[PDB]
């Protein structure tokens, strides 16, 4: 599962929606960066749409002609809001007068065409249920059995572009709504703007205080050189923050480091715990600027995730996070995204065990033995799976020394496989 704040003219506004294996334009992030998430083969993708406040749905009302005075019976509107030139053409059927042919356009090409007898309920049901109407909803104005008036190419109007303006207040809606939900990772939609990235960093720190250790993925802007890339990657020093360094090509677009971070997050989530992207090839056709050994070392030292064309294909140079500018108490393995998500999953499963031990167990020696034995059992199962080479889980005597009667602190420390 991955979060996506797509800056898209298409998509449901102000709400999180999941997408199965089933937007399309290159200007809308639902496909421009929806592709970067989808191609990583994450099991499920959950999206959010960034839209300016002044933006609503386009609508279109239609009336009848069986009675000598026309009266509204059918209304049409976009499935999600947009100002796109989505037209509808309705023509009398050639064979039977009662039947009406309902034609829909994206811009001008025939998106849909079908004929229904004339009853309003079946017409709206055809315009809703049928697959070609993924871009449009029909709604009934009133119950009737009359024939509609003939119209041609009626654009659904009454809204604005979802890409009307990318702003901090517009951007923060995604994070505010993602507060409720939990994800393996969240990634910025390519806007390598310092205000947006820093607001996201503060938001993720808050969620960390809540125990929601969602993985944040980022990158510098196109104009950033190795100097600016490294400066901005060093500016963040969170275990959950990742700053992709280089721009990349997939087919046509010079995807910015922030944009490429979408595909890096998709790879990280799809890999899970077992797979690491330390030297994993990537589908990108090219990456620039080229990085030597010194440039690679400086970028990694600055917490930058580096993609380089040092072989036949683009290869992620290392699976590093912005915490690579480490501290002495934590080893360098702390500063690796696979290990970070592994630790967050451990924290989540131990939180589940905490829900399994709510207080019904007394805070005596016996309850301590019970809880630590349950944790030992879980880590032993992980060891049998081969994920853990060695672990030691024991009481957190320092925090348990000052712990009150109602609180209980423990700790764990486990080692994992290396890959060179």
């Amino acid at each position: 599962r991955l979060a996506m704040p797509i800056r898209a003219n298409w998509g449901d506004v102000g709400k999180v929606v999941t997408i199965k294996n089933d937007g399309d334009d290159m200007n809308y992030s639902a496909f421009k960066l929806g592709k970067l998430a989808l191609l990583g083969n994450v099991k499920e993708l959950l999206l959010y749409r960034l839209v300016d406040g002044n933006q609503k749905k386009g609508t279109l009302t239609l009336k009848d002609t069986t009675e000598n005075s026309a009266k509204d019976v059918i209304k049409l509107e976009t499935k999600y809001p947009t100002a796109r030139n989505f037209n509808v053409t309705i023509k009398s059927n050639l064979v039977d007068s009662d039947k009406k042919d309902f034609i829909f356009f994206e811009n001008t090409k025939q998106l849909f065409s079908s004929s229904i007898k004339g009853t309003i309920d079946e017409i709206v049901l055809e315009i809703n249920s049928n697959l070609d109407n993924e871009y449009v909803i029909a709604t009934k104005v009133a119950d009737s059995d009359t024939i509609l008036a003939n119209v041609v190419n009626q654009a659904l109007e009454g809204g604005n572009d979802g890409c009307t303006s990318i702003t901090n207040e517009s951007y923060l809606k995604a994070l505010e709504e993602f507060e409720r939900y939990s994800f393996d990772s969240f990634v910025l939609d390519g806007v390598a703007d310092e205000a947006l990235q820093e607001t996201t960093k503060a938001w993720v720190a808050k969620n960390k205080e809540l125990g929601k250790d969602i993985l944040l993925f980022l990158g510098g802007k196109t104009e950033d050189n190795i100097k600016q890339i490294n400066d901005k990657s060093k500016s963040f020093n969170d275990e959950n923050i990742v700053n992709v360094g280089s721009s990349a090509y997939y087919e046509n677009i010079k995807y910015t480091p922030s944009e490429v971070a979408v595909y890096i997050a998709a790879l990280s989530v799809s890999k899970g715990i077992t797979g690491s992207i330390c030297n994993a090839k990537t589908i990108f056709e090219e990456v620039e600027p080229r990085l030597s050994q010194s440039e690679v070392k400086e970028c990694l030292k600055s917490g930058t995730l580096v993609l380089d064309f040092d072989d036949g294909d683009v290869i992620i140079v290392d699976d590093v996070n912005t915490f690579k500018k480490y501290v002495d108490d934590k080893n360098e393995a702390m500063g690796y995204i696979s290990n970070i998500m592994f630790i967050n999953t451990i924290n989540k499963d131990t939180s589940l065990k905490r829900k399994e031990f709510v207080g019904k167990i007394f805070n005596d020696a016996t309850g301590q033995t019970t809880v630590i034995c349950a944790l030992k059992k879980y880590f032993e199962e992980l060891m049998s799976q081969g994920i853990i080479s060695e672990f030691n889980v024991d009481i957190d005597t320092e925090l348990q020394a000052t712990a009150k009667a109602d609180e209980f602190y423990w700790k764990w420390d486990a080692v994992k496989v290396d890959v060179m």
Partner: protein, 130 residues
Amino acid sequence: IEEASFLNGSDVVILIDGVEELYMEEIKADFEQDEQSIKLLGCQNEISRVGTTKGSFSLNGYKTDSKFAKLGFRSFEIIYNLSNSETLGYESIRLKNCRLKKLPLINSKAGEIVKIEVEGSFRGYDLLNE
């Protein structure tokens, strides 16, 4: 005449399957081995080796519920906290993957307490404390 201490057997606290058991009187457990004695072809005293190990355990207590009959032959853990009071060095042992040899469905006499007896086998242990 400096102090000594015997570990009185009423300090036991048995947790079977993660829930404390209150009515147990006696608990026994031990970790067997097949000796695999080999008589060498020239030397005149037998030689023994570890061989393969096997666990066995037993429990006695008062019947307070049908916990064990419900449990069946399903695997379960046992933890044994033998506390000491003169000094607080409790000896804690955990038995891994215990399994009842027989469900004590009914064991009752007319004019006596309804005691429960259990015996089985455990694949391994782990000395949690000492």
